[PDB]
């Protein structure tokens with residue numbers, strides 16, 4: 001007999017304040033009883049379990065489907081807490097790649113002796129005329145919260161020396177599987193694989209001969225030797241959609257978006273607001289139907305990503321899809337993508353393109369640092385001057401990593417720029433607006449230095465809306481260059497946030513007016529402090 | 542040589558915090574450093590039985606091309622029971638020099654029971670290998686309990702130096718040792734080297750800035766409007782500021798660039814306002830039981846302004862940073878350096894770090910701040926998404 005190297009156990013403690021599991025045993029059928037009896041018999045013969053007595057006051061329910069289903073759910077609550085899948089695009093191409101998989105993964109790893117007593121379960125004897133057969137686990141139980149962590153720690157511990165001894169082979173452990181790539185010759189590769197197999201056999205870890213040649217179907221991916229993709233995307237076809245099926249659909253499209261360029265989930269995601277019901281039927285706008293249609297169009301032609309080569313620059317390129325949607329491709333060589341993706345703008349009242357672009361760059365940077373452990377060079381649809389002006393004049397600190405301007409319209413641009421100082425030879429519009437908090441009636445308007453005045457009466461309105469309204473009026477009736485004095489901290493705040501798009505249509509119209517202007521200077525003054533030219537007397541009526 | 546018993550605050554479990562993504566060179570530097578630290582018994586690898594994790598990354602201090610391991614101990618520090626000496630004369634000292642005494646901390650062994658809370662993880666690229674896990678067998682740098690435990694030892698080290706010349710103020714915060722004096726920078730340097738080899742054996746220059754109003758021969762409408770806005774703002778902070786005679790100049794409706802001659806009463810009002818502003822603020826005190834709030838405003842052109850306060854419109858300190866070091870093209874770098882300086886000054890003056898409110902989006906800061914960060918400590922921070930009107934007023 002070969003002296004299998006002992007795997008040192010992991011000390012396991014129950015949660016403080018909680019005790020061992022005590023739960024009744026199920027009224028199982030006689031057939032299931034016989035099956036479980038056989039299974040546990042041969043299991044004991046293998047040494048994965050041992051029989052105990054009545055002393056142990058801990059019992060967990062058991063079932064059969066044969067296959068023994070042990071329910072640890074009430075133990076999992078009484079067991080202590082224990083301490084992201086690899087992305088194909090980050091995997092570095094190797095000449096040969098072998099998939100080993102350990103059989104009896106958890107049962108190959110012993111359990112902490114002191115904890116074994118807590119894993120007890122009972123097999124009911126037929127017609128309840130005999131005390132049920134007691135059993136406990138000597139190894140990591142299937143469905144036990146502590147099994148995966150302990151198993152992977154043990155596995156890692158065993159794998160360290162082989163790895164250190166063989167720097168010319170790369171090995172990745174996931175759960176019960178080991179993936180060994182290498183760039184050496186095929187024969188030496190197979191030899192080293194067998195070496196690893198016997199090395200694991202030293203600790204009693206069984207791995208198959210022969211295996212499982214590519215393509216590998218793994219975690220929703222297809223891994224081919226030279227390239228990777230996603231397993232086929234199945235979009236359900238229903239005459240009337242359900243919210244649950246919209247969760248399914250959006251999830252699937254999202255999954256397909258990491259490789260397939262141009263996926264748009266915006267409409268479908270907009271239709272899920274405040275639903276919280278799985279049976280609820282929702283309609284679809286022309287935009288939504290066309291979106292899902294062109295999404296079906298994108299999923300016609302199959303596309304593959306390549307693997308990662310450290311020798312070459314990593315490049316991220318971004319395009320604006322519109323309506324707060326952005327799409328990006330991360331690639332090594334032209335037309336060959338590592339992967340792709342999308343960014344949707346955060347829910348907000350107002351916003352501009354530049355901000356969303358920045359946020360996109362941040363997202364891509366974090367994703368990259370996760371996958372390739374580095375920040376990619378960026379190709380962005382924004383002129384250097386535009387970015388320069390923006391970040392220099394922005395009230396907030398902002399930054400983008402190393403990047404270059406790619407010219408592929410639509411280009412991100414600054415639509416309007418407010419003046420730093422008052423404009424000489426430009427009419428000065430003093431604006432004000434107010435509303436009655438009861439009647440919801442108000443006025444908005446302006447008086448200027450050239451004598452120009454306007455006051456517009458308004459129904460169904462608020463003070464803020466009348467201040468915005470007053471500014472809008474000043475913008476409409478003024479020449480290409482204008483100085484506007486407002487007492488509104490609200491309006492000034494919004495305009496100083498510099499949105500190019502807004503939820504409020506009033507703000508949108510103001511933006512339009514701004515865009516049509518050559519020079520605009522927006523000045524602010526304290527209200528009610530009796531500043532001349534600023535007329536509350538007109539609007540407060 | 543002996544481990545003082547250490548626990549957590551009552552009703553608080555150990556810290557569990559997600560390790561954030563790290564770049565490749567940082568991962569490598571951490572691997573090397575932690576290997577060498579493991580060989581020295583400072584840290585030891587641990588198994589899955591430890592649920593607790595605290596974030597870790599790598600930095601580079603100036604004059605050093607060699608990496609340093611920075612642990613973010615914030616949550617662990619918050620979760621340690623309050624451990625039971627502030628030299629207000631340190632801020633008064635003409636000069637203060639900062640030292641890193643962290644190398645001394647690793648001699649003292651950490652309480653064995655508590656060691657499970659110092660656990661951290663070196664992350665792997667693309668989750669190809671599970672992260673390497675460690676725990677500290679000695680006093681970890683950045684932990685609040687480390688200077689508190691080494692406090693007595695440090696006293697023993699500093700007995701001869703402190704007794705020798707007691708014109709020199711010594712303070713200790715985290716891994717940092719601050720030394721103030723009135724001496725000359727040459728003699729100061731020689732003295733600091735003396736204390737350095739003294740450490741072998743066993744530069745700062747320390748008021749709330751006045752609110753100032755322009756002095757002009759001729760005022761436009763715009764000038765007076767801004768003046769009125771600033772004075773009205775300041776009226777929150779100061780009791781007797783009155784704008785009514787200045788607002789009376791704006792009366793009628795005139796072009797913004799039109800010059801308005803000051804009247805007698807208006808000039809008087811402006812003068813009285815100046816005099817009021819020249820005085821300090823009424824009843825401004827520092828409550829040690831209150832949080833320190835720091836606010837930073839980007840002024841453009843490398844200029845930044847800041848205010849430290851425990852209560853709105855009562856300012857414990859105010860300041861401005863124009864300092865240009867390698868930061869020109871990068872806003873976030875500047876901001877990080879500013880946060881560091883403000884925090885340092887806060888440490889000197891009140892002994893503790895302020896809670897920041899940052900003029901930057903959360904995601905941007907979160908992404909890039911560790912790249913520019915040279916400090917061994919870290920403060921708390923907030924993000925203000927609405928542009929302040931006070932920007933112009935602190936310029």
Ligand SMILES: N#Cc1ccc2c(Oc3ccccc3OCCn3ccc(=O)[nH]c3=O)cccc2c1
Pocket residue numbers: 086091092093094095096097099170171172179180181182214216217218223224225226307
């Ligand atoms: N089932 C399955 C399975 C198989 C291999 C995995 C993996 O495989 C690898 C394991 C170690 C080193 C490189 C690896 O792949 C690099 C990229 N690659 C990938 C496949 C191929 O034929 N050739 C190739 O150069 C890395 C990560 C997960 C894997 C999952």
Ligand SMILES: [Mg+2]
Pocket residue numbers: 432433434467487488
């Ligand atoms: Mg108004």
Ligand SMILES: [Mg+2]
Pocket residue numbers: 432433434487527528536
């Ligand atoms: Mg008003």
